[PDB]
Copies of this chain bind each other. A is one copy, B any other.
Amino acid sequence: YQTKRNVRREARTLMGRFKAGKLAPVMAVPVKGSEGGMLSQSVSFELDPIAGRMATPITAEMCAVFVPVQACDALKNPEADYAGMTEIVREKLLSGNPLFVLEPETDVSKRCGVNPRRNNGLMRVNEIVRLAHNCAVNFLRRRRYVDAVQLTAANHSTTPAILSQTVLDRFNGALDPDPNVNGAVQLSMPAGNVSLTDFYNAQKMDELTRVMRKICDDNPEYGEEMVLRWAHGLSVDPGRVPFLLAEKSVVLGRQIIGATDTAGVEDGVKRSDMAAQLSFTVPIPTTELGGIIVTFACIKPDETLSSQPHPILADHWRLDNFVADELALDPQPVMARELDYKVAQANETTVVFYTGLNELKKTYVSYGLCRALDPNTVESKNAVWQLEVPLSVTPETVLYPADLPQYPFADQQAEVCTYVVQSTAVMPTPMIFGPSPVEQLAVIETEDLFE
C-alpha cells in the first residue's frame, strides 16, 4: 500500500455572504493519508450597492492552509503530554476508536459547506472541521507577530480579519528592548576591576542574541522553543506544524451606473458596483495520516493612518544637534501623543513602544478627509472607508476590531459581499473501492433458464 492505484475527485460549488473585515472561511477540502494530486479553487466577489463613487481601494483576500491531523489533536487534548506527536495519533488510530468524533453543527462548519448528517433526528458534523479552522486562523496570526493571541478549540463563530502590517512593524519599534544588546558587564568590587573577559564574552552575546531573534521570528511556529533547541543542537518534529498553499489579492474594480430620471440627474444620483475574481491551482500535499485544506476569503479596506500627528509641523521647530544624535546609540521612548490625536487626557504621556532616534520622521503616510470638511456633506462621493483604529492602545494588535462599521453601504450590519466558490479536487488515492452490483432478473427464476 502507500501507492497510487485508484483515483477520487470532488467538485463542490457553494454560494453565500460574509461581512467585511472578517476572515470568513469558504470551504474545507478533506485529505486522507497518502492522498496527493491537484486542487483548483476559484472565488467570485460581489458587493452590495454603494452610493456615489469610491476612489478608496478595496482589497480582496484568499488563503489556503493545510492543517495536519497532528495539530488538530493538540487543540483537542492540549494538557495531554505528547498530544501532538505523530505516533500518539498513530497508536490511537490503531486502537479502533475514532480519533475525531461527531459534534453538533456550528457557524464554522456551515460556512465551509460541510453538509450535515441526520443521526437520531439531529444534525452532526465531525469535530475536525472546527479544530482545523481554529488552528488555521491561529497560524495566520503568528506570521504577522509571533506573540499573538491564539484561539482555543472552543471557538464556534467567524473570526475577525488580520492586518497586513502591525503598528510596531510599521515603525520597527519594540515594547521592551533587551538588556543584552548594548548590555551590562559585571564589575568586581570587593579598589576594583571590570576585568577583560567579561565584555569579551559579551559584545558577541549582543551578536548571539540577535541571531536568536531571527530563528524564532523567521519561523513563528516553534517560536520561543526552537531557539532553546537550536542552542543545544536539537531540532523540532516537522509534521505537526501547518503550512501555506497559496495567497491571492487584487483591488476590486469599479463600475459606475448613473441615474437618468429628472430628480436623480439634478441631484447627481449614481452608483458604484464592485466585483472581482480570484483563483489558484496548487498540488495537494501528501502525508501519512492526512489533513484538511481550509480555504479563507476576506474583503478589507485600505489600512492607512488617517489620524497621526505631523512629525515636523505638529511639534516644535528646533535646531537639531547632529553630534548628540549620532551619540545616542540607544532606544528612545515614544508617547501616545505622537501616534494620534484621539488620545485620552490621562494616556497622553505614556510610553507605548520604544524605537530608534528619528523614527516617525523617516516615513509619514496619511489618507483621510480635511478637518474643515463636515462629514455630513459628500454622502455622494463618500469614498472614505478606512479602518479608524483607535491606535496607541494595543500597538502590537494583529486582529481587526470585532465590530467594523460599514459606512458607505446602506446597511452597516448586513453581510455586504456575496461570493460563489468553485472548488475542484482530483485526488489519486490508495482506496480499494469495489465492483458494482447488478439487478434482479425476472426471466431466470420465472422460467428456470439455468436448469
Contacts and interface: CB of A to CB of B under 8 A. Distances in A.
Q: Which residue of A314, A320, A435 has the most chain B CB atoms within 10 A of its CB atom?
A: A314
Interface stretch (A134-142, A166-174, A305-313): A305-313
A406 interface: no
Interface string A262-275: 11111111110000
A234 to B, nearest CB: 6
Interface string A420-432: 0000000000111
Nearest to A261: B261
Contacts of A372: 16, 107, 110-111
A420 to B, nearest CB: 8
Q: Which residue of A48, A205, A312, A366 has the most chain B CB atoms within 10 A of its CB atom?
A: A312
Contact of A363 (B9, B14, B431): B9
A109 to B, nearest CB: 8
A325 interface: yes
Interface string A45-66: 0101101000000000000000
B271 A115 contact: no
A148 interface: no
Copies held by the complex: 3
A164 interface: no
Contact of A384 (B15, B270, B310, B369): B15
A370 interface: yes
Nearest to A340: B118
A355 B436 contact: yes
A205 to B, nearest CB: 7
Interface string A356-370: 111101111111111
Interface string A203-228: 01100100000000000000000001
Interface in A90-126: 90, 93-94, 98-102, 105, 107, 110-111, 113-121, 123-126
- 9 A-B pairs closest in CB distance: A16-B370, A357-B434, A262-B264, A356-B434, A93-B319, A325-B432, A110-B371, A117-B314, A30-B312
